[model samples]
Target: EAAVCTTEWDPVCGKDGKTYSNLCWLNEAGVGLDHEGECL
Candidate 1:
């Protein structure tokens, strides 16, 4: 299952090479998470 982020400060990187404030935000945008932390 996908993880849910409670805070917006937790940055996440998407497979599309975009950065989201958190996993929740990324999921809202309909993008898959490439990894945790930040976009490189």
Candidate 2:
């Protein structure tokens, strides 16, 4: 599991290059770890 998040969790273009710490998005997309999800 990652100690910290780095993606903006935005599933769009412009945000593609941006970085988000929102774990909710990752969990919703099924791409976040258990610990990471909790970070949300």
Candidate 3:
């Protein structure tokens, strides 16, 4: 059996001052989250 992963574009701000699609995407790139929303 296979499980599917769902993605949500909640937008997370990374330490690099860039907005990612979500926290999963940010961590996947080895980046830290600055905030839980979009980048300023």
Candidate 4:
């Protein structure tokens, strides 16, 4: 079966000062991870 990325409230921060609703999305976006949780 195909992988499904359902909508969820998983807050994540990006190194580029971008925020994401879910870590999956952030990862899928290719920004990867500089850090987890809220942005600082």
Candidate 5:
């Protein structure tokens, strides 16, 4: 069976000197992943 997954938003900005939106989650395979949620 595929494992459960979750997500969130967090990231670090350069000039802004702060963390932006980030998406962190574990895929169906139970693998962990993370990235900025903001549009690139």
Candidate 6:
């Protein structure tokens, strides 16, 4: 189960070519992660 995550600014890129606010935020989404930082 998902738990409360920190409000950090560690951005993560998703396979959907979208930018996740943080790793935890990425987990919130169903899309798998591609890499770190904004997708470009």
lDDT of candidate model 6 versus the reference: 0.88
lDDT by residue (1-40, candidate 6, tens digit) is 4557778999999999889888988888878999989987
Error at 12, model 6, angstroms: 0.5
Give TM-scores for every candidate, taking all chains together and pairing residue i with residue i.
0.71, 0.27, 0.70, 0.64, 0.20, 0.77
* Candidates ranked by lDDT: 6, 1, 3, 4, 2, 5
Error of 4 at 32 (Å): 2.6
Relative to the unseen true structure, what is the C-alpha lDDT of residue 12 in candidate 2, on a scale of 0 to 100? 27
Q: Which is the leading candidate under TM-score?
A: 6
What would the per-residue lDDT of candidate 1 be over residues 1-40, giving only the tens digit for each residue? Answer: 6555566588888999899997889898899899888877
- Per-residue lDDT for 1-40 in model 5, tens only? 4543334444423232333433222232233343333324
Give each model's clash number: 0, 3, 0, 0, 4, 0
Which residue runs of candidate 4 sit more than 4 Å off their true CA positions? 1-3
Scanning candidate 6 in windows of ten residues, the lowest lDDT window is: 1-10
Please provide, for model 4 over 1-40, each residue's C-alpha lDDT reduced to its tens digit, 9 standing for 90 to 100.
5775658888888778678878878888888677667785
lDDT of each: 0.84, 0.40, 0.79, 0.77, 0.34, 0.88
For model 5, the superposed segments whose C-alpha errors exceed 4 Å read: 1-10, 22-40
Model 4 weakest 10-residue run by lDDT: 31-40
lDDT of 3 by residue, 1-40 (tens): 3533238878888999988887778887788888888887
Better of 3 and 4 by TM-score: 3
1 or 6, greater by TM-score = 6
